[PDB]
Enzyme design. Structure first.
Site, PDB file in Angstrom:
ATOM      1  N   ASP A 278      47.771  32.559  42.195  1.00 43.30           N
ATOM      2  CA  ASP A 278      46.373  32.178  42.395  1.00 43.30           C
ATOM      3  C   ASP A 278      45.437  33.402  42.525  1.00 43.30           C
ATOM      4  O   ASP A 278      45.890  34.539  42.712  1.00 43.30           O
ATOM      5  CB  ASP A 278      46.235  31.278  43.626  1.00 43.30           C
ATOM      6  CG  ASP A 278      46.174  32.078  44.927  1.00 43.30           C
ATOM      7  OD1 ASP A 278      47.093  32.888  45.181  1.00 43.30           O
ATOM      8  OD2 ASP A 278      45.199  31.900  45.694  1.00 43.30           O
ATOM      9  N   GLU A 316      45.949  31.152  37.741  1.00 46.76           N
ATOM     10  CA  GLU A 316      44.559  30.717  37.776  1.00 46.76           C
ATOM     11  C   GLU A 316      43.663  31.951  37.707  1.00 46.76           C
ATOM     12  O   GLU A 316      43.821  32.878  38.496  1.00 46.76           O
ATOM     13  CB  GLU A 316      44.266  29.910  39.041  1.00 46.76           C
ATOM     14  CG  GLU A 316      42.809  29.468  39.189  1.00 46.76           C
ATOM     15  CD  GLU A 316      41.932  30.493  39.905  1.00 46.76           C
ATOM     16  OE1 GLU A 316      42.435  31.203  40.808  1.00 46.76           O
ATOM     17  OE2 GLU A 316      40.732  30.582  39.572  1.00 46.76           O
TER      18      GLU A 316
END
Ligand SMILES: OC[C@H]1O[C@@H](O)[C@H](O)[C@@H](O)[C@@H]1O
EC number: 2.4.1.18
Length: 586
Positions: A278, A316
């Site tokens: 992330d 991401e």
């Protein structure tokens, strides 16, 4: 060795000169002297002193009698002359809440990845992911206690398996002091949190998931430095792991070793099938570019691909940094997959609008095909979307109740046919009305009593997953322009979108979406493959509490030109629904 430092650093069991015991290793080039304190010492640092080494900077020692199960720490004299108790960075088990400290357990045996698990990570596979926060999936009724790993293996594996998902994605299970971080503010990168049981229990949870035919994706955190409990900052007195807000020093060899090494740990010693990273943007920040973050991701990915091919990584990244899911030699970074944040934002914004204003925002459903070939996408409806007053997915939908549920059902119908792998965060499959709370069990009570609208969505998602996995057309060619073709791309005043998905051997499944309450009878559009067409999925079916509108059987094509094509179908499109048609051999 130089790649798997977890095999030699930390506390490991050995026998020298004949007698047994455990040996401790810790990397600290600076710092005056270092000792081991635990249950075998009365916690007395005067007893077992360690010897530092020159061409490494590692204190080491072999304590006889000290066995698996006992707790220990390191009593050190910091390079500035201070007395500070440190937990082992390479701790394999710990103890949360009522303290901090490492355990002696060693490494688990280790997992050789089977061939069905590698096949499932591939670009041509159906991939549908159930994202879960272990702490808030379910809770015991009486007292509100967490389910342990073993109880999750008996309840969460069968559920994800029955619902038809191929992958399980966990929010970070590395040791962390507060539940409010959800796992993203870690203190021990090599220890599964002790919240749900031992590390062997976790290992057992993963075995059970494999045994049920699921792969496991683990949320991985190299982008957030331990800023808690003094676990990794000012380690030996100097900026060991950190720079010179607290970020990693990806530049050093041994630090990069601590991070890369941690990645082989989960994949080889726990049988994890994939890793998701992330806030990649927060890590690599054009003008701010942190050269050493970009290179660390590239080396991690390269090394993973070389050491454990079959395992993959996903990321991401929110700034459209070109080439996130592309091979290092060009753009680079080297991730297999990328979260499609743009599609999530576009389709939701569209989905939110009153069905009556959708005619002016058609470009939100089409725009995603323009750039579908610049990255390898996962379509994500994840945890970030249902917190902080963002509402649940169901509360985003317009109209009275039945309309919100028809909209949501149609959206999933659209999502599951659109090029890209699928990701759904727990609670979405049964349409939870309230935002996610990490502190509480999910609203499983909505599913109590007689069949209701929430059972309807839950049944849909299962049929969606099963159907999607059965037909190659739906998953084989997500990342090849051949896999998707528009049939009707410009019916803006009615909000109808029709397209085709295509398998390697040319087979077509037709997807039609009606995004207004007005049912369309005798809707004619062109096709490439004439013959007999039949519904195989209908989100308006009464099996999901739709109004049960549709085509009621085979529909044959007519040799009547339409939309520039020689043949056409004339169909019913149910209100706020999407349907999938297959062709019958003859
Ligand atoms: O603790 C179990 C119960 O907790 C409640 O907060 C949830 O809304 C219920 O659905 C759940 O079954």
């Amino acid at each position: 060795t130089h790649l798997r430092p977890y095999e030699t650093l930390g506390a490991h069991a050995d026998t020298m000169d004949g007698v047994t015991g455990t040996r401790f290793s810790v990397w600290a080039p600076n710092a005056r002297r270092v000792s081991v304190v635990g249950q075998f010492n009365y916690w007395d640092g005067r007893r077992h002193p360690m010897r530092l080494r020159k061409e490494s900077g590692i204190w080491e020692l072999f304590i006889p009698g000290a066995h698996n199960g006992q707790l220990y720490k390191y009593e050190m004299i910091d390079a500035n002359g201070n007395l500070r108790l440190k937990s082992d960075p390479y701790a394999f088990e710990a103890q949360m809440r009522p303290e901090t400290a490492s355990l002696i357990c060693g490494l688990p045996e280790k997992v050789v990845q089977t061939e069905e698990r590698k096949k499932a990570n591939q670009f041509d596979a159906p991939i549908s992911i159930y994202e879960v926060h272990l702490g808030s999936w379910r809770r015991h009724t009486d007292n509100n206690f967490w389910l342990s790993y073993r109880e999750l293996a008996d309840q969460l594996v069968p559920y994800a398996k029955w619902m038809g998902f191929t992958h399980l994605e966990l929010l970070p299970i590395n040791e962390h002091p507060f539940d409010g971080s959800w796992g993203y503010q870690p203190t021990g990168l090599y220890a599964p949190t002790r919240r749900f049981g031992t590390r062997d229990d976790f290992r057992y949870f993963i075995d059970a998931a494999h045994a049920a035919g699921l792969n496991v994706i683990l949320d991985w955190v190299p982008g957030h430095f331990p800023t808690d409990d003094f676990a990794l900052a000012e380690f030996d007195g100097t900026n060991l792991y950190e720079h010179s807000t607290l970020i990693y020093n990806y530049g050093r060899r041994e630090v990069s070793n601590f991070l890369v090494g941690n990645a082989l740990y989960w994949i080889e010693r726990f049988g994890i099938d994939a890793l998701r990273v992330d806030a990649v943007a927060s890590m690599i920040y054009g003008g701010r570019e942190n050269l050493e973050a970009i290179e660390f991701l590239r080396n991690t990915n390269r090394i993973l691909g070389e050491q454990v091919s079959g395992a993959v990584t996903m990321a991401e990244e929110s700034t459209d940094f070109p080439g996130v899911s592309r091979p290092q030699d060009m753009g680079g970074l080297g991730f297999w997959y990328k979260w499609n944040l743009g599609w999530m934002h576009d389709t939701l914004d569209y989905m939110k609008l009153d069905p009556v204003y959708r005619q002016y925002h058609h470009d939100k459903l089409t725009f995603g095909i323009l750039y579908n070939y610049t990255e390898n996408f996962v379509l994500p409806l994840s945890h970030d979307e249902v917190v902080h007053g963002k509402k649940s997915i169901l509360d985003r939908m317009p109209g009275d109740a039945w309309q919100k549920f028809a909209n949501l059902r149609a959206y999933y119908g659209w999502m599951w046919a659109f090029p890209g792998k699928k990701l759904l965060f727990m609670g979405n499959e049964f349409a939870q009305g309230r935002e996610w709370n990490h502190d509480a069990s999910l609203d499983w009570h909505l599913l109590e009593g007689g069949d209701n609208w929430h059972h309807g969505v839950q049944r849909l998602v299962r049929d969606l997953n099963l159907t999607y996995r059965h037909h190659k057309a739906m998953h084989e060619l997500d990342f090849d322009p051949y896999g998707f073709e528009w049939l009707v791309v410009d019916d803006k005043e009615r909000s109808v979108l029709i397209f085709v998905r295509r398998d390697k051997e040319g087979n077509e499944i037709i997807v039609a979406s009606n995004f207004t309450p007005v049912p369309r009878h005798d809707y004619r559009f062109g096709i490439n493959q004439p013959g007999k067409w039949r519904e195989i999925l209908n989100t308006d079916s009464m099996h999901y509490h739709g109004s049960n509108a549709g085509n009621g059987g085979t529909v044959h094509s007519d040799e009547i030109a339409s939309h520039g094509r020689q043949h056409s179908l004339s169909l019913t499109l149910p209100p706020l629904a999407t349907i999938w048609l297959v062709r019958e051999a003859e």
